[PDB]
Design a protein around this ligand. Structure first.
Ligand SMILES: [Cu+2]
Ligand SMILES: [Cu+2]
Ligand SMILES: [Zn+2]
Ligand SMILES: [Zn+2]
Lengths: 153, 153
C-alpha cells in the first residue's frame, strides 16, 4: 500500500479524515488531514492495536506495540510503534494534522492498515510524566474519536 | 492476522457485526455474525477494494478483484476475491451470517484486512444474470451498509 485513510468518529463532536501516504515501503509515512470539534490545544494521537470498534474506541486496545517497548514520543527510540505524539487544535477547534513518521508503515511488521487511529482527550506527555501511566498511555486520557485505518487509492 | 472484525453501518437502519477467523494462514476463513435492518430475502455480500469510507460505502470502489476475474459466486473458480455471495435476511429483517471461504484471507495478497465489507440492496445473481452488470456487480444494487475490516484480538 502507498496510501491509506481513516474516518475518525466518536460519541461527541470530534470527527475528521486522516490520510496516510507512503511513497516507498522503506520510507516515512506522511499523515495529514483535518479533525474538527477538538478543544484548543494538544491532543494525544496514536495508532492502537486492534481495528475493532464494536465497543466504540474502547475495543481498539492499547497502543500498537509489536516490539513491546514503553510509551514515548515519536522522536524517541523507546516508543510504541503507534506513538505519533500530539496533534494541536486551533481556537476554532480544528487540528490541521501534518505529521511524518518513519516507524509506522503501510506494510510489513509495523503495518498500521486494519488498526485504529485514536485522538485523545488530553495532551500526550510523551512518556515524561514520571508515573506508570505515562509509560503506558502518556496520560492522554479518554478516546474522543477513532476509526479503522483502511487501504486507499 | 488470525482474527478480524467489521462493524457495518449505513445511511439507513442497516447495522451489524461480522467476525472473521483464520486458524492457519493457508486455511479457510470463517465468517459469522448478524446484520439487522434488512428486507426479508437475499442480499449481496462482498468485500470491496478500498477501506475508504470518506464517502460512506460509495468510496470503497468495486469488488476486491486482485486477479482481474469476472464476478461469480463464492464457490465458483471464476470469481472476484471479494465475492462472498448472498446473506439471507429472515422475516424479522435479520440475516444470520455463517460462511467459510477459501479464497479470501486475513494475510498475504488476498488479504481483506483494511478493505470494506459491504451488504447490498438486492440479491447477487452470482454473475449468471446474462448481462454486463452481472459480470461486474452481480446486479446486487445499492450499498446499504459497510465497514472497514480491522484486525481483532
Ligand atoms: Cu491513543
Ligand atoms: Cu458489493
Ligand atoms: Zn504509546
Ligand atoms: Zn464480484
Amino acid at each position: 500500500a502507498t496510501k491509506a485513510v481513516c474516518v475518525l468518529k466518536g460519541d461527541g463532536p470530534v470527527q475528521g479524515i486522516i490520510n496516510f501516504e507512503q511513497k516507498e515501503s522503506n520510507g516515512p509515512v506522511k499523515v495529514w488531514g483535518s479533525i474538527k470539534g477538538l478543544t484548543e490545544g494538544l491532543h494525544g494521537f496514536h495508532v492502537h492495536e486492534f481495528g475493532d470498534n464494536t465497543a466504540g474506541c474502547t475495543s481498539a486496545g492499547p497502543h500498537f506495540n509489536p516490539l513491546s517497548r514503553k510509551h514515548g514520543g515519536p522522536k524517541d527510540e523507546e516508543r510504541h510503534v503507534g506513538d505519533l505524539g500530539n496533534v494541536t487544535a486551533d481556537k476554532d477547534a480544528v487540528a490541521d494534522v501534518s505529521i511524518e513518521d518513519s516507524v509506522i508503515s503501510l506494510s510489513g511488521d509495523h503495518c498500521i492498515i486494519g488498526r485504529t487511529l485514536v485522538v485523545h482527550e488530553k495532551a500526550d506527555d510523551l512518556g515524561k510524566g514520571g508515573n506508570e501511566e505515562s509509560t503506558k498511555t502518556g496520560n492522554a486520557g479518554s478516546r474522543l474519536a477513532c476509526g479503522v485505518i483502511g487501504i486507499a487509492q
